[PDB]
Design a protein around this ligand. Structure first.
Ligand SMILES: COc1cc(C)c(S(=O)(=O)N[C@@H](CC(=O)O)C(=O)N[C@H](Cc2ccc(C(=N)N)cc2)C(=O)N2CCCCC2)c(C)c1C
Ligand SMILES: [Ca+2]
Length: 223
C-alpha cells in the first residue's frame, strides 16, 4: 500500500495472508472455511494465515490453516485480467473471534464516490521497494466508470472498477494482490492490477465482486 497508514493489529479481521513459504498475496475470509482472492494469486501449496499483523513475528492471534482446494473462476483470462477472482477452501474451519472474522458479500454494487478501505502487506513505494511487516490501510473512493475507462482505454471490463486518486500518491501495490476493498461493511473489490503503483492518472483496478456473488454462493454450496 502506497501512501497509506498502519491499520493497527487485527483491526481488519477478515484480511488473510496467503503464504507459500513467504507472503505472496492477500485475501478475504468470507466464512469460517472459505477465502476469496485474485485468480492471479493462484499457486499450489498455499497456507492461509489469519489473525496476522506482523507477518514475520508470531504475536499470538494467528491461525495457520492449509488450503484443501483452490478454484479459479471458470472464465479467468490471465492476459486481460478479466474475472480475476479465486476461491480457496480451508482444510479445517477457522475459529471466528473478534480478531478473526468474516466479511459479508455485497447484496448490491457500490457506486462511484463511495469511500472504501483497502489493505495489505504490499510495497509502500511507487518508485523503489520497501515491504512493511505490519498491515497497511488506505481509504480510497470508487471512481466513475468514465474516468476509469479514460484512464485505461480499452482495458476496463464490466467486471472491474477503479478506486483511488487520479493525482496519484496513494494506491495498492505489488503484494497487495488478492486483498480486500471494503465499502459499506461489505467486500466490494479485490486488488487486481494497475499501471505501476500510485502513478498520476493510473488508479488501481479492482475485481467487481458484486458480479460474482452467485458464482461464489453456488461454488461454496457444492464444495
Ligand atoms: C497482463 O500482464 C501484465 C499486466 C500489467 C497491467 C502489468 S503492469 O503494468 O506492470 N502492472 C503491474 C504492476 C506491478 O506488477 O507492479 C500489476 O498490475 N501487477 C499486479 C499487482 C498489482 C495490483 C494492483 C496495483 C495498483 N493498484 N496500482 C499494482 C500492482 C500483479 O502482480 N499481477 C500479476 C502479474 C500480471 C499482472 C497483475 C504487467 C507487468 C503485466 C505482465
Ligand atoms: Ca504474525
Amino acid at each position: 500500500i502506497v501512501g497509506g497508514y498502519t491499520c493497527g493489529a487485527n483491526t481488519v479481521p477478515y484480511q488473510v495472508s496467503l503464504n507459500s513459504g513467504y507472503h505472496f498475496c492477500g485475501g478475504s475470509l468470507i466464512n469460517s472455511q472459505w477465502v476469496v482472492s485474485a485468480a492471479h494469486c493462484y499457486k499450489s501449496g498455499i497456507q492461509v494465515r489469519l489473525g496476522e499483523d506482523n507477518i514475520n513475528v508470531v504475536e499470538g492471534n494467528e491461525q495457520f490453516i492449509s488450503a484443501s482446494k483452490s478454484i479459479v473462476h471458470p472464465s479467468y483470462n490471465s492476459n486481460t485480467l478479466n474475472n480475476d477472482i479465486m476461491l480457496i477452501k480451508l482444510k479445517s474451519a477457522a475459529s471466528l473471534n473478534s480478531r478473526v472474522a468474516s466479511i459479508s458479500l455485497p447484496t448490491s454494487c457500490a457506486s462511484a464516490g463511495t469511500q472504501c478501505l483497502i489493505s495489505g502487506w504490499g510495497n509502500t513505494k511507487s518508485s523503489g521497494t520497501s515491504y512493511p511487516d505490519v498491515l497497511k490501510c488506505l481509504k480510497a473512493p470508487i471512481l466513475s466508470d468514465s474516468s476509469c475507462k479514460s484512464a485505461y482505454p480499452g482495458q476496463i471490463t464490466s467486471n472491474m472498477f477503479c478506486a483511488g486518486y487520479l493525482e496519484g500518491g496513494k494506491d495498492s501495490c505489488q503484494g497487495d494482490s488478492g486483498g480486500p476493498v471494503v465499502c459499506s461493511g461489505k467486500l466490494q473489490g479485490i486488488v487486481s492490477w494497475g499501471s505501476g503503483c500510485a502513478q498520476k492518472n493510473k488508479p488501481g483496478v479492482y475485481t467487481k465482486v458484486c458480479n460474482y456473488v452467485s458464482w461464489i454462493k453456488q461454488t461454496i454450496a457444492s464444495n
